[PDB]
Amino acid sequence: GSSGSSGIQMKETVEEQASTTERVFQDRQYQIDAAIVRIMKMRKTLSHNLLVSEVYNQLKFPVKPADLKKRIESLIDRDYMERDKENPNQYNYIASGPSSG
């Protein structure tokens, strides 16, 4: 949604410390799931290699194999992508929604 009864909406901060924050936990999962939905969508049908490759290009940060894979599988079961009867390496687009360009 939106901040709510707010005037301006724009935030941005930069921190350089080995330590790990908590907000970086949600931002990550989103960065991935988002990059996947965006990629898959645009590509009616994409494979694992083509996927992992595209996603990485969209993410300027290294992602773990457990998280990445998990994100995919889920999405697929989230009525977003389907595994080609032939091989589970290929995923087709199913999500329903209008588009402009």
3-state SS, one letter per residue, for 44-81:
CEEEHHHHHHHHHHHCCCCCCHHHHHHHHHHHHHCCCE
Start-to-end C-alpha separation, the chain: 23
CATH code for position 60: 1.10.10.10
In the chain, the number of structural domains is: 1
Tell me the CA distances in angstroms from 59 to 4, 6, 101, one per residue in order: 29, 30, 22
Give the three-state DSSP class for 82. Answer: strand
Here the tokens at position 28 are 């990550």
Instruction: Identify the experimental approach.
Output: NMR
Cβ contact 40:91 at 8 Å: yes
Whether residue 77 is contained in a domain is answered as: yes
Domain that holds residue 92: 22-101
Cβ contact 82:91 at 8 Å: yes
- Provide the CA 76 distance to its chain's centre, in angstroms: 12
Whether residue 11 is contained in a domain is answered as: no
- Provide the CA 18 distance to its chain's centre, in angstroms: 25
